[PDB]
Structures are given as structure tokens and as C-alpha cells.
Amino acid sequence: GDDRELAILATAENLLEDRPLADISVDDLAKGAGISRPTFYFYFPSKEAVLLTLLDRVVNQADMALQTLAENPADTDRENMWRTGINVFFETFGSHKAVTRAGQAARATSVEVAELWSTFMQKWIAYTAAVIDAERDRGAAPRTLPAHELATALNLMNERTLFASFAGEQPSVPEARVLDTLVHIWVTSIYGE
């Protein structure tokens, strides 16, 4: 039950590497998972539900890694503190580029995908603002913009910029340059007057 489900999810992630969800039939999913079409429909209502589950897994993997870091601070300067946090997103979404691409496309057509993405962006922005607020309270960062507004723009930059790098968009920052680029902008905008 868990095993046919994981086989369907694994098949979908593999097929998304080579074509969009629109070009994957539920027949393709059932065939890769070694089940029939009706048996598929027992585990998922639709191929869209399979993508929602894949995206939910990736988003929660990033969130749990951020929670781990939040509990287990690295012993490092402020630049490295922010770099390690942005790296959670770089590594987690960068390790699942096909699901990342497909999920972003699904935001336009799926209220459940849009709501999942909104929920976690709100969480990550709130955490970012709490860290900025802590840095200001300790005297390490200046009281410039409203922390939640700064956090929002920085998180949206990372969403757009990581996505463009992963998707090979024109324009994009090269993938081998994107982490340093984002870290610079975060550190200067958080600590700068």
C-alpha cells in the first residue's frame, strides 16, 4: 500500500524529468508502478494529485531541514548563517528540479498547489523576519525596513531566482553562481545602512 504509492510517486518524478505532466497519462504512471489503471485510482484520484503529493514531500523536506538548522545553529559568522539557510532551499529544490518545475506550473491551475506553496512561503517569510528581528535586538543589524516586508522581498527573490537557475531560463544566474549571488544580496540588505 505504502509500496505501490511510493512506486507511483517515483514513476511520476522520473517521467517529469523528460516531459510535462500534460504529456504523462495515468496509464504511464500505472505501467511504471507495475499496477493497472484502476488500481492507480485506488491510491490517487488523478495525476494532478500525484504531483501535489510530490510537491508536498519536497516542500516538507525543505521545511524540516530548516527546522533542523533552526534547532542546530552552525558556529560561523552572519554571512555563513544566512548561506547555510539559503542552501537548504538550493539543495532541496535543486535535487528535485523536475518536481520544482512541474509544481510551479501547477500553481496556475491547482488551488491546492497554490495554497500549499502560499502556506510554506508564509512560514519561511515569518521565520526569516524572526531571525532579522533577533539580529536587530542583539544590535547586529540596523533597524531599517519593516523586517516582514524585507523578508518577503528576499524570499520572493530566492523563489524566482532559484527557479530561473534550475529551469535554465533566459535570463538566469548560472546555477554555480546563484548561491553566492543571493547570499550577497541578503547580507547587504539585512546588515546595511
Ligand X SMILES: CCCCCCCCNC(=O)N1CCC(C)CC1
Angstrom distance (rounded) from CA 26 to CA 172: 33
Q: Give the one entry of ligand X, a second copy, none that residue 79 binds, where binding means its C-beta sits below a cut-off of 5 to 8 angstroms depending on kind.
A: none
Segment 145-164, which members bind ligand X (CB under 6 A)? 155, 158-159, 162-163
The whole-angstrom distance between residue 63's C-alpha and the CA centroid of its chain comes to 9
> Can residue 127 be called a binding residue for ligand X (CB under 6 A)?
yes
> Can residue 72 be called a binding residue for a second copy (CB under 8 A)?
no
> Can residue 159 be called a binding residue for a second copy (CB under 8 A)?
yes
**Chain residue whose CB lies nearest ligand X:** 85
Segment 92-121, which members bind a second copy (CB under 8 A)? 105, 108, 118, 121
Q: Specify whether the CB–CB gap between 15 and 32 falls below 8 A.
A: yes
> Can residue 144 be called a binding residue for a second copy (CB under 8 A)?
yes
> Can residue 102 be called a binding residue for ligand X (CB under 6 A)?
no
Task: Dig out the grid coordinates for 53 from the structure.
Answer: 503529493
Cβ neighbours of residue 52 closer than 8 Å, sequence gap 6 or more: 106, 110, 112, 113, 116
Peptide bond into 171 cis (omega under 30): yes
Give the 3-state secondary structure percentages of the chain, helix then strand then coil, rounded to 5. 75, 0, 25
Question: Diameter of the chain by CA atoms?
Answer: 62
> Can residue 89 be called a binding residue for ligand X (CB under 6 A)?
yes
Give me the sign of the Cα torsion angle 124, 169, 172, 165: positive
Segment 15-34, which members bind a second copy (CB under 8 A)? none
Q: Out of 86, 150, 178, 190, which residue is the one contacting ligand X (CB under 6 A)?
A: 86
Q: Out of 15, 83, 85, 183, which residue is the one contacting ligand X (CB under 6 A)?
A: 85
Q: Please report, as ranges, the residues that interact with a second copy according to CB under 8 A.
A: 105, 108, 118, 121-122, 125, 144-146, 149-150, 152-157, 159-161, 164, 169-174, 177-178, 180-182, 184-185, 188-189, 191-192
